[PDB]
Write a protein that binds this ligand. Structure first.
Ligand code: PLM
Length: 393
């Protein structure tokens, strides 16, 4: 059996009936606690009554604290409405709403510098409620239950700038929220136009995804447009993605439904940086330097770092190798001075050649003494399975 309405084993039916009795006290506060609704929670925890109940009660508490009942009427900040990419557009062959995620032109720094992380997360919650509401409308129009969504995840333009830690963490917060509050809602997710950086980028959010979500992700190759047309009718897919749908004015991208992001104009900023902490701190003497070592053995790794200096700029460069002078080592990222005391510095480097990498903070050119440098560095690894897919497609 599949644990779905109309296909329950006697044990699952008994569990469903018991589950309803056990959570009776919170059902009135729910929009429509039918059997489909309850079974999403049971399936998400393999019909373990205790875990399923804990999951649903936590969701109920979440709805209360986030005022989900009124979130659709809540209007997100102007900068978010204008620049947060993505959009609901069309229905798949089964009648399920399709959601488009446009990663490339998303300006995470711009959004985080112009709005609170709370409003960003709330906007995402709202999109989820808008999608569920669309499912409810499709259920009425099609005369049958529609409760899942199809996602087209456009990774064209995915680059190193998207690995910026604060953005990834915020996104991770959304994903955990989605996994805990909208179980059994994702039907299928098509990753299209995934670039070379995909395996590393995916490995960053993979920890936030449930096994059920991971199994629904399909990384598509060169024939992605044809694959989409096997699940979605051509008139329901924008011209931009291989279909025939366009905006009334003839735009192939259907911008009336899909937001394509873009960099946020400086006039919207309310800050030039987000609050930041570092895992390490060193005091560098005048005319001296400090070396930080990381062994990179696996190819395809990416070094990601963030650092700030106190009161004065500092030099920074990355080398490949015991304490050697910069000149004795191989220069991978040319040493340069950064005003990391004015604006926090962050960066990434793709590590092609394995070896011992040395990030070197340089103060050899200065008399300013005891410069305090705060930094955080990580070696980002590629998701093995994803690496293999990139070789196939
Ligand atoms: C419903 C959401 C499912 C999640 C699907 C994730 C598919 C892989 C996404 C990799 C994204 C790369 C990281 C981008 C981080 C950012 O937003 O800046």
């Amino acid at each position: 059996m599949s644990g779905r309405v109309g296909d329950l084993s006697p044990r699952q039916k008994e569990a469903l009936a018991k589950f309803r009795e056990n959570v009776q006290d919170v059902l009135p506060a729910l929009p429509n606690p039918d059997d489909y609704f309850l079974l999403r929670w049971l399936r998400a925890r393999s019909f373990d009554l205790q875990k399923s109940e804990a999951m649903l009660r936590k969701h109920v508490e979440f709805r209360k604290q986030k005022d989900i009942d009124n979130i659709i009427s809540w209007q997100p900040p102007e900068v978010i409405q204008q620049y947060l990419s993505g959009g609901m557009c069309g229905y798949d062959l089964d009648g399920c709403p399709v959601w488009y995620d446009i990663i490339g032109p998303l300006d995470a720094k711009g959004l985080l510098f112009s709005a609170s992380k709370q409003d960003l997360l709330r906007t995402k919650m709202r999109e989820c409620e808008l999608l569920l509401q669309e499912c409810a409308h499709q259920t009425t129009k099609l005369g049958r239950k529609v409760e899942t969504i199809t996602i087209i995840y456009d990774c064209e333009g995915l680059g190193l700038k998207h690995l910026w830690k604060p953005a990834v963490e915020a996104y991770g917060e959304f994903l955990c929220m989605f996994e805990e509050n909208y179980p059994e809602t994702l039907k299928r997710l098509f990753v299209v136009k995934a670039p070379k950086l995909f395996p590393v980028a995916y490995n960053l959010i993979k920890p936030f995804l449930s096994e059920d979500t991971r199994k629904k992700i399909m990384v598509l190759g060169a024939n992605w447009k044809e694959v989409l047309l096997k699940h979605i009718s051509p008139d329901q897919v924008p011209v931009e993605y291989g279909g025939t749908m366009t905006d009334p004015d003839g735009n192939p991208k259907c911008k009336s439904k899909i937001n394509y992001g873009g960099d946020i104009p400086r006039k919207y900023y309310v800050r030039d940086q987000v609050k930041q902490q570092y895992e390490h701190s060193v005091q560098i003497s005048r005319g001296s330097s400090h070396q930080v070592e990381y062994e990179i053995l696996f190819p395809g790794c990416v070094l990601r770092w963030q650092f700030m200096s106190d009161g004065a700029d500092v030099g920074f460069g990355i080398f490949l190798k015991e304490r050697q002078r910069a000149g004795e080592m191989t220069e991978v990222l040319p040493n340069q001075r950064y005003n990391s005391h004015l604006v926090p510095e962050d960066g990434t480097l793709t590590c092609s050649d394995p070896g011992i990498y040395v990030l070197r903070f340089d103060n050899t050119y200065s008399f300013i003494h005891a410069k305090k440098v705060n930094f955080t560095v990580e070696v980002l690894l590629p998701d093995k399975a994803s690496e293999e897919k990139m070789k196939q497609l």
